[PDB]
Each structure stands twice: as C-alpha cells, then as structure tokens.
Design an enzyme around this catalytic site. Structure first.
Site, PDB file in Angstrom:
ATOM      1  N   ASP B  25       0.798  -1.219   0.000  1.00 26.03           N
ATOM      2  CA  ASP B  25       0.000   0.000   0.000  1.00 26.03           C
ATOM      3  C   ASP B  25       0.831   1.268   0.000  1.00 26.03           C
ATOM      4  OD1 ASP B  25      -1.914   1.936   0.275  1.00 26.03           O
ATOM      5  OD2 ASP B  25      -2.790   0.979   2.151  1.00 26.03           O
ATOM      6  N   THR B  26       1.035   1.848  -1.186  1.00 30.23           N
ATOM      7  CA  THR B  26       1.814   3.068  -1.321  1.00 30.23           C
ATOM      8  C   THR B  26       1.158   4.259  -0.627  1.00 30.23           C
ATOM      9  OG1 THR B  26       0.888   3.523  -3.517  1.00 30.23           O
ATOM     10  CG2 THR B  26       2.949   2.277  -3.441  1.00 30.23           C
ATOM     11  N   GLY B  27      -0.139   4.200  -0.355  1.00 29.96           N
ATOM     12  CA  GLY B  27      -0.816   5.238   0.399  1.00 29.96           C
ATOM     13  C   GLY B  27      -0.776   5.173   1.882  1.00 29.96           C
TER      14      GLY B  27
HETATM   15  C1  LIG Z   1      -6.891   1.064   4.505  1.00 30.90           C
HETATM   16  C2  LIG Z   1      -6.789   0.765   3.015  1.00 30.90           C
HETATM   17  C3  LIG Z   1      -6.995  -0.716   2.723  1.00 30.90           C
HETATM   18  C4  LIG Z   1      -7.777   1.573   2.170  1.00 30.90           C
HETATM   19  N1  LIG Z   1      -7.471   3.012   2.092  1.00 30.90           N
HETATM   20  C5  LIG Z   1      -6.312   3.343   1.240  1.00 30.90           C
HETATM   21  C6  LIG Z   1      -5.073   3.672   2.084  1.00 30.90           C
HETATM   22  O1  LIG Z   1      -3.937   3.742   1.217  1.00 30.90           O
HETATM   23  C7  LIG Z   1      -5.197   4.910   2.983  1.00 30.90           C
HETATM   24  C8  LIG Z   1      -5.119   6.228   2.176  1.00 30.90           C
HETATM   25  C9  LIG Z   1      -5.149   7.404   3.142  1.00 30.90           C
HETATM   26  C10 LIG Z   1      -4.003   8.204   3.324  1.00 30.90           C
HETATM   27  C11 LIG Z   1      -4.055   9.271   4.211  1.00 30.90           C
HETATM   28  C12 LIG Z   1      -5.216   9.549   4.908  1.00 30.90           C
HETATM   29  C13 LIG Z   1      -6.359   8.755   4.731  1.00 30.90           C
HETATM   30  C14 LIG Z   1      -6.321   7.681   3.844  1.00 30.90           C
HETATM   31  N2  LIG Z   1      -4.119   4.860   3.966  1.00 30.90           N
HETATM   32  C15 LIG Z   1      -4.199   4.678   5.287  1.00 30.90           C
HETATM   33  O2  LIG Z   1      -5.269   4.587   5.877  1.00 30.90           O
HETATM   34  O3  LIG Z   1      -2.959   4.609   5.866  1.00 30.90           O
HETATM   35  C16 LIG Z   1      -2.933   4.523   7.323  1.00 30.90           C
HETATM   36  C17 LIG Z   1      -1.708   3.676   7.723  1.00 30.90           C
HETATM   37  O4  LIG Z   1      -0.579   4.535   7.484  1.00 30.90           O
HETATM   38  C18 LIG Z   1      -0.997   5.862   7.834  1.00 30.90           C
HETATM   39  O5  LIG Z   1      -0.597   6.719   6.810  1.00 30.90           O
HETATM   40  C19 LIG Z   1      -1.728   7.276   6.155  1.00 30.90           C
HETATM   41  C20 LIG Z   1      -2.911   7.135   7.063  1.00 30.90           C
HETATM   42  C21 LIG Z   1      -2.548   5.884   7.922  1.00 30.90           C
HETATM   43  S1  LIG Z   1      -8.746   4.113   2.234  1.00 30.90           S
HETATM   44  O6  LIG Z   1      -8.208   5.461   2.126  1.00 30.90           O
HETATM   45  O7  LIG Z   1      -9.505   3.746   3.428  1.00 30.90           O
HETATM   46  C22 LIG Z   1      -9.819   3.896   0.798  1.00 30.90           C
HETATM   47  C23 LIG Z   1     -10.790   2.896   0.699  1.00 30.90           C
HETATM   48  C24 LIG Z   1     -11.534   2.718  -0.475  1.00 30.90           C
HETATM   49  C25 LIG Z   1     -11.285   3.573  -1.566  1.00 30.90           C
HETATM   50  N3  LIG Z   1     -12.005   3.415  -2.729  1.00 30.90           N
HETATM   51  C26 LIG Z   1     -10.314   4.570  -1.461  1.00 30.90           C
HETATM   52  C27 LIG Z   1      -9.580   4.738  -0.287  1.00 30.90           C
END
Ligand SMILES: CC(C)CN(C[C@@H](O)[C@H](Cc1ccccc1)NC(=O)O[C@H]1CO[C@H]2OCC[C@H]21)S(=O)(=O)c1ccc(N)cc1
Ligand SMILES: CC(C)CN(C[C@@H](O)[C@H](Cc1ccccc1)NC(=O)O[C@H]1CO[C@H]2OCC[C@H]21)S(=O)(=O)c1ccc(N)cc1
Ligand SMILES: [Cl-]
Ligand SMILES: [Cl-]
Lengths: 99, 99
Positions: B25-27
């Site tokens: 997960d790059t996000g």
């Molecule tokens: C939890 C994942 C399986 C799904 N997510 C994508 C994810 O990359 C999010 C994307 C993301 C990024 C920033 C803020 C909210 C969401 N990242 C995230 O929650 O990361 C958490 C763990 O590391 C921390 O760094 C970032 C937040 C914490 S999500 O944002 O909930 C999501 C779900 C469904 C869709 N269609 C689009 C996005």
C-alpha cells in the site's frame, strides 16, 4: 517515472479543468477526491477504510490527467483527508509496483 | 517482480512462524496488521485514515519477510480491515511505483 517511497507519492492531477495534487495509492480500490463540482448524474455510495465509512458521490466516465497521462473512469467525491488515485485509474496509465 | 494493479497487490508475509498475506500500500505511511501471535507488550499509538482515528498497538524491531524479501522495522497491530504493508517497509525491500 520511477517513484521511490521515502515520502508520500504525490503527483499533479488535472480534473474538471483544475490542477490539484493526489496520492498514488495502490491500497485504494477506487479514486476518491475532496469535494468539487463534476458533470453528469451521480449516485450515492459508502466507502470504508481504517476508521470506518464515509458517504461519497459516485461520478462515472470522468476525465483526469495524472502526472500528464490521460485516464477516464469513476471518481468518488467526499470527505477524504487527501485526494487519492486508486487502482481503477492507476491501471489506465499502466502503473506498476516493482521490486 | 513487476506487479500490475488490476487486482489488489497482495503478497505473502511471514512473521515468526506465521504465514499471512498483506496489501502492498503506497498510500500507507505505516504497516498495520490485525493480529500477531504472542507478541508481548506494545506501545500505544493512534493512526488515522478515511473514517477517523484508531488506537493501535506498536511493536518495534519486527523481522518480517515480504514477498521473499527480509525487512526489519515497526509493525502496528490494530483494527485494519485488511493487512497493509506501508512505506516504512516498502522502502526496505526496494519497491518503487513506475509508469
Ligand atoms: C486502509 C486501506 C486498505 C484503504 N485506504 C487506502 C489507504 O492507502 C489509505 C489512504 C489514506 C491516506 C491518508 C489519509 C487517509 C487515507 N491509507 C491509510 O489509511 O494509511 C494509514 C496507515 O498509514 C498511515 O498513513 C496514512 C494514514 C494511515 S482508504 O483510504 O480507506 C480507501 C478505501 C476505499 C477507496 N475506494 C479509497 C480509499
Ligand atoms: C460528498 C457529499 C456532499 C455527499 N453527501 C453527504 C452529505 O451528508 C453531506 C455531507 C457534507 C457536509 C458538509 C459539507 C459538504 C458535505 N451533507 C450535505 O450536503 O449537507 C447539505 C445540507 O446542509 C448544507 O450544508 C452542508 C452542505 C449542505 S450526499 O451526496 O448527500 C450522499 C448521501 C448518502 C450517501 N451514501 C452518499 C452521498
Ligand atoms: Cl508473494
Ligand atoms: Cl504475549
């Protein structure tokens, strides 16, 4: 490009004639952007992530330019803390993870 | 490998004697999994995503095999709907995003 992951992989996008920035997120199934006006009819949806669910508007067949590459597809609009480009559009530009 | 994104980019992970899978997960800044076997005491932490903020259990210096590659670093245990490998470990295995 080839993007390393020491910082968030943010890129310039163009949507609705507006320049914005968004996170390239291989963990997101679908693209979700912060509130903005888009053309056409929308449908109400829910998406869930860490944290729980949010209410979003689903718009279909939206043109977006991602780092200079054209993609057309579904865009969700709602209260995400960051604009996210998910796999539905990453596949259209041929993005891959390499290691 | 060179991984396309038509389906979720899940890979094999091994921690201790446990074989699991997780999403590359790059996000995600941070690596978060739902459970780890008998892992001892943790440090409390909060993380936030779409949805809001959750309490997690932080563990440092965890040896983890990711798609065949060894990494050592911090793993969070918490109520994530899917196990995620975030950038803190993706950088250790040399992963890049390409298009
Ligand atoms: C939890 C994942 C399986 C799904 N997510 C994508 C994810 O990359 C999010 C994307 C993301 C990024 C920033 C803020 C909210 C969401 N990242 C995230 O929650 O990361 C958490 C763990 O590391 C921390 O760094 C970032 C937040 C914490 S999500 O944002 O909930 C999501 C779900 C469904 C869709 N269609 C689009 C996005
Ligand atoms: C992305 C949002 C705009 C989507 N909407 C969610 C809705 O709860 C918003 C959530 C909301 C809250 C604040 C700002 C924008 C959106 N509320 C809202 O529009 O309230 C309106 C009435 O009061 C006015 O002041 C606030 C906006 C106006 S919604 O389109 O009605 C909708 C409803 C249910 C689902 N599942 C999906 C979408
Ligand atoms: Cl694998
Ligand atoms: Cl224990």
């Amino acid at each position: 490009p080839q993007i390393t992951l020491w910082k968030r992989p943010l890129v310039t996008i163009k949507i609705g004639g507006q320049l914005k920035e968004a996170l390239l997120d291989t963990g997101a199934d679908d693209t979700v952007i912060e509130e903005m006006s888009l053309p056409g009819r929308w449908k109400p949806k829910l998406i869930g992530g860490i944290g729980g669910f949010i209410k979003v508007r689903q718009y279909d067949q939206i043109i977006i330019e991602i780092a200079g590459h054209k993609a057309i597809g579904t865009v969700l609009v709602g209260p995400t803390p960051v604009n996210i480009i998910g796999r539905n559009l990453l596949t259209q530009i041929g993005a891959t993870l390499n290691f």
